[PDB]
Amino acid sequence: HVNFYRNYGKTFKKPRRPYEKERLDAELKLVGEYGLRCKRELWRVQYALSRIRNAARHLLTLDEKNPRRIFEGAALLRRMNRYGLLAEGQDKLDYVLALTAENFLARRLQTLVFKAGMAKSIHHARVLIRQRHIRVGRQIVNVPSFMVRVESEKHIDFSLTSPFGGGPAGRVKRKNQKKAS
């Protein structure tokens, strides 16, 4: 049976100490302020953060003049700068270590939509994303966690179909017009 060979993986890890106030309120800080559905959203981000930090930490144990150091470091640094997760002049691969969970949560499609306007709240933005109401370059991206890159940041906008930035009206809008007529 082929298709057994397809891979699948895990994206988040549950916390070791279930019930501690200081960790627990800090989590609600992030969840509420970024408009998240559940703690799983935040845990996967931290799991992905830990992946690169282990990667970046491992290279930093290697030395300069190391081909793996040079090749792997630049690719990681490009990946960070490409998503904007690292400021300018920050190209030292010691500042990847300083990176936080806030930054990844400020590149999400949900958060960038609110920071650009268009929404009037973080929680409006999300339902505005899942209701086919926002394209990115030319495609209707309907995942609140899209993780927008810098080059695509300019073209984030309304759809060419969505009543608020596209074409014809919605079901309730047409319903009210027909009952008036």
């Binding site: 049976h1 082929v2 298709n3 060979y5 081909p67 040079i70 090749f71 630049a74």
Partner: protein, 261 residues
């Protein structure tokens, strides 16, 4: 088992075919032929995979049953015929010719050529020895056996072979100072020049080969194949001139092609 094996499951196929692990459960099993089925490329791959003259296993079947495809001078109907190093693949309907040689990354390429390079191939001799009634003959690594060669062609040497008259038309005496292309290992494809050969009584001998641009590498004598006498080749080297490189260098090349684009 109680006999031969007729199936090749895809995960077990040679890595240099670049077959994709979800494209099916099996692979083309290379038929018995002039090449050793792990250093070959069958015909099915060449047509459907690389050239895309076909979309399915059945379509490549039909093409050969029209007989458009010729290999090494002769028309081959076999689907999984084991084409190899320095074969010629020619399609007179399209009027195109190919030599089969390696990338620097060790994968077969169909190297497009004229007619005048289709007339001949190169082969290294496996051995030269007497035979029936003392009639000298030689083994190549292409299965071929040529009787009555020059008494100069010794073992490991390389021969030019006209596909029309079929006998030796030239030969290179394998030794230090000629250009070679490597046909196995991690160094396969990398061309260069024999700088030294150190033998070891009762083992394989090691060849020392240096890229035109300084880089030095070594193989064992099995994976060596002289192309030309001296620095110059007698065949057309592929899209990269047999010079292998660090991963940084091709990273630099793209962005260098990405600064002009």
């Amino acid at each position: 088992a109680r006999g031969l094996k007729k199936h090749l499951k895809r995960l077990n196929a040679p890595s240099h075919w670049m077959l994709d692990k979800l494209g099916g459960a099996f692979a083309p099993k290379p038929s018995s032929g002039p090449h050793k089925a792990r250093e070959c490329l069958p015909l099915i791959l060449i047509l459907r995979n690389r050239l895309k003259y076909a979309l399915t296993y059945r379509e490549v079947q039909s093409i050969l049953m029209q007989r458009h495809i010729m290999v090494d001078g002769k028309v081959r109907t076999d689907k999984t015929y084991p084409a190899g190093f320095m074969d010629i693949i020619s399609i007179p309907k399209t009027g195109e010719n190919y030599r089969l040689l390696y990338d620097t990354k060790g994968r077969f390429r169909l190297h497009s050529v004229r007619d005048e390079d289709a007339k001949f191939k190169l082969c290294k001799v496996r051995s030269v020895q007497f035979g029936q009634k003392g009639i000298p003959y030689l083994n190549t690594y292409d299965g071929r056996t040529i009787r009555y060669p020059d008494p100069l062609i010794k073992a490991n040497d390389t021969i030019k072979l006209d596909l029309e008259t079929n006998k030796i038309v030239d030969f290179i005496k394998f030794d230090v100072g000629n250009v070679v292309m490597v046909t196995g290992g991690r160094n396969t494809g990398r061309v260069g020049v024999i700088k030294n050969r150190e033998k070891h009584k009762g083992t394989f001998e090691t060849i020392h080969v240096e890229d035109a641009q300084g880089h030095q590498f070594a193989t064992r004598l099995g994976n060596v194949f002289t192309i030309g006498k001296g620095t110059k080749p007698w065949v057309s080297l592929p899209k990269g001139k047999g010079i292998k490189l660090t991963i940084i260098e091709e990273q630099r090349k793209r962005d260098a092609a990405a600064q002009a684009a």
